[PDB]
């Protein structure tokens, strides 16, 4: 099995770093960024991490709000060539990571789960459909285990929350296909609930 | 000048569909989209294929459904939008 | 990453061998036995095996089928005490397993996931709800890697059928909470499809 | 007999311990009405009692708080 430790949500204190805006205006113009950057230099490949704190003895996932209906994990885009748990980190460091100059390390070890992108479109699937040669974007899920204790700097325009589990499952709706299926995936390991 | 390619078994690749045409002498394919559920990624057997030259969709509607891929003849089926 | 090798459809041959009944006859009487079974020793531990192959270089589930809706995964209950891992490979053996009597091997190095039910009725969940201390079943999922070729032989009851990955996906109405999300589950592993050589 | 204002975090267990910390050691069946999508306890209870029992829990349960709540006990 595969044992992780989970803290309570209280024992992490959230602080607050400038505003950090999507590289594009519109979803139209996200596609036409991605039909461009394709073409020159292939598939994109984003990365992204899952943070697990509990409350109550039940896990809950760190998410990132914008608005009221927006929802995202941590993560972003590799640079080519760049190996794929070392841009994590980074991409980790950029948007939760203190400012206050502590040292912060991200432990990231497995591999949660794989969704890749058809076509220059919205949906994405955990698998590459059998007509499908060239996916336009491959993202790649990491369980992020937490320290006991931890400061996450988040950016103004962002707003970290806790899910619980239940919150989360069965609702696409809600999150969509990638993290609402997070229970599932997260259901494999095995949880220490400690208590602060 | 696109052109609707059907008939497709749901594993025929658009290196699948490349390939036939290029062995038809066409090499002025400008796009392949497939048509797929939303839900499920599945390819509904058929694809949009826009290409470059008249010439090259008058080789398409004539030649591919003469060639089998995976078993089974495209359908032609010009665009008229 | 995790490597699995996948084969085609066609390297397994499916044989057919006498019918394997449930233990209960109606829904009423199964949850019944759990029930009952529950205060002698405990929960009930159910295990399953993800038995995964390809067609196409996309990665098909091997499932049984009851009739014309009904779909579930290899396995069942272990005995109390029994191991977790030893008791799938015997409860594999008693489903698929071939006749001829050949020693069958199996292969179980993966987990896929958890599902817990908390009262007596069908809802599972993939977490224990905060409210709950002792769910009276726990369902495990493993990972079953398949050699390159293989003889099975499925009971006369059932039919054997290979479920591409898109057919479960976002289909809980058709294969329920379990087996659809099993695209998901699966999508960690690195798979290898080995295509005919012949 | 309803239990109502209960976290989602109250067990059978919990229930358990606070109604017999009363003196009510006659508990018929109890139920926890959830969320059928997700499982989740709705935050109220329905238990099985004595009115020699159910006196004491309509007026003594609300005063000691579960997990920082004061359950709100209604008529069955």
């Known amino acids: 099995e595969r044992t992780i430790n989970l803290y309570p949500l ?4 959230f602080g607050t770093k400038e505003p950090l805006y999507e590289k594009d205006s519109s979803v139209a113009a996200r596609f036409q960024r991605m039909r461009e950057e394709f073409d020159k230099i292939g598939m994109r490949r984003t ?8 409350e109550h003895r039940l896990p809950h996932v760190l998410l990132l709000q914008l608005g009221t209906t927006f929802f995202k994990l941590p993560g972003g885009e590799l640079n080519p060539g760049e190996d794929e748990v070392e841009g994590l980190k980074r991409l980790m460091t950029e948007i939760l990571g203190r400012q206050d100059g502590v040292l912060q390390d991200w432990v990231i070890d497995d591999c949660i789960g794989n969704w890749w992108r058809p076509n220059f479109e919205p949906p994405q699937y955990p698998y590459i459909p059998a007509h499908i040669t060239k996916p336009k974007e ?3 899920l990491f369980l992020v285990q937490l320290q006991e204790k931890a400061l996450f700097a988040v950016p103004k325009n962002y707003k970290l929350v806790a899910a619980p589990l239940f919150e989360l499952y069965d609702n696409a709706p809600g999150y969509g296909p990638i993290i609402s299926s997070l229970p599932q995936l997260l259901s494999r390991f095995n949880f220490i609930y400690n208590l602060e | 000048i696109a052109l609707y390619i059907g008939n497709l078994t749901w594993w025929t690749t658009d290196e699948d569909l490349t390939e036939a045409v290029h062995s038809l002498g066409v090499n002025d394919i400008l796009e392949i989209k497939f048509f797929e559920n939303r839900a499920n990624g599945q390819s509904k057997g058929f694809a949009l294929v826009g290409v470059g030259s008249e010439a090259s969709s008058k080789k398409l509607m004539d030649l591919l459904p003469k060639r089998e891929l995976h078993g089974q003849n495209p359908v032609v089926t010009p665009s008229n939008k």
Request: aromatic share 6%.
């Open chain 1, 10 to 13: 209280t024992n992490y204190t």
């Open chain 1, 47 to 54: 990365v992204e991490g899952v943070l697990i704190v509990h």
């Open chain 1, 138 to 140: 491959h993202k790649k």
